[model samples]
Target: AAQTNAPWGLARISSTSPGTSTYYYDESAGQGSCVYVIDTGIEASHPEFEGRAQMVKTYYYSSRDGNGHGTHCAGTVGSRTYGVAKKTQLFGVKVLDDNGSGQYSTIIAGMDFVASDKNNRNCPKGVVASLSLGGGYSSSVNSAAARLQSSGVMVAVAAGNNNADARNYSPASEPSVCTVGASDRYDRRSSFSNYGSVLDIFGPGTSILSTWIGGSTRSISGTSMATPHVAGLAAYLMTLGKTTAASACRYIADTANKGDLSNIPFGTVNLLAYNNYQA
Candidate 1:
């Protein structure tokens, strides 16, 4: 339970695999949940990803998968078999174009999409938005996150992969957004993961294996990988009656076993404890 690659554990819990038990005590399958992914587009045809994704929009601000970074990030979160939230609806908002970069305004537009779901007569309310991208701390983005929060949206953002001060990024640095950091399989902060008091929690990010574009599979490491693990867990918790982000966070934080980390700098913190607190 203390493993950093908890998403894999989560997969086993829900999968019909040997020596694997169910996740929720109630045996729920997160059948009706939804998550809006504001990042690179995901491969919708992977075997592990048969009926698990629905793209609300695909705004390729760039021309193509310039560096393949966006695709890597997308696969980590919502690919068919390897993703943490394999059974939930995935709404894609490709703010970054083929160049692997987009203006901050592009991301804000994605946020607006999530926040405006309430007004979409065809769309249901209470969708969680997973943001694996971020800029430096920006008051403007914080304002956007606040709007999403007010609209009952849970905004999960990566704590940045700079391995520097974690408080340096925008949406992640924002108090309204659930800031996520990366931990290795050993439950230690990734060497490249940023750290700061503002970070809300940590999850598996090192050498994480997930579905890639073109029916391929691969592994990558970064806070980007961890963000979606937490996001997927939040959706599962919601299925179990932990609706709000606060409740979900508290539940995970409280439920995770105390970690054992002495190798990396700052060691490990009890993320499940942060997610498990009962308000």
Candidate 2:
């Protein structure tokens, strides 16, 4: 297998541009490639991404005003083109509303939506699934992740934003899932990033800038922010000929930047290094 390196300026580019033309118009033009964003729904019309925003599917399984977490995340993953897969289609599954909490059933429903054939056709075609949400791992969630993988869907989960990793959450911890961690602008682990043996790749998450609610831009932090960077990279890699989560993950792992940090979880994989390895 060919080694995959991290794509350069992923979060950085998104953060700096925080709009459509810069990334999306320049890269993928929201080309009908479906990508399910299982989070809060965004505003749908922000300047940096006004005419370019489209929500193929929206699900509010929990709260009505799910506080824009999903929206913010969606913007990071596929809003306006700032998202790595700017031209890709998006399915907004609101398992956890503005409150940031959802029941297992809600999650199951979201998963079911992505798994359904009717939905699949409008979404990712042999595409990757960008999942930035996580909680305690459950058998059902694990099973769902496995099922998605079996169906050729690449599952990308967030490795909690907490600095400590005493207990990593589900889906992210699931074997078939690609769990992403966070690093600072300098490529060091963010103070609050979760780390463990289950961790797969790391991305730009610290002091990162991107589109915010109401069509504005802001610098934010957290595992949530980092997750989309990887999601975007996944999409970009697809353009470069990477077709599956396993293949993308393998490339990331093999081409990661081994920094000077001791016992680095992913051992030197820079999220921006991918620019050199583009297919």
Best-matching candidate per TM-score: 1
- lDDT by residue for model 1 (115-213), tens: 886355232324567787887888888788778766777777888999876676888778767777787655566788777777767777777776666
Per-candidate local distance difference test:
0.62, 0.59
The weakest ten consecutive residues by lDDT in model 2 span: 16-25
**lDDT score of residue 63 within candidate 2:** 26
Candidate 1 versus truth, CA RMSD in Å, comes to: 5.2
Taking the tens digit of each residue's C-alpha lDDT, what string does model 2 give over 78-143? 654345656665556666766777776677677766767434365443456667777776778767
Query: Once superposed on the true structure, which residue ranges of model 1 sit more than 4 Å away at CA?
Result: 1-27, 61-80, 118-126, 262-269, 272-279
Q: Please count the clashing residue pairs in each candidate, in the order shown.
A: 27, 25
Which model scores highest in lDDT? Answer: 1
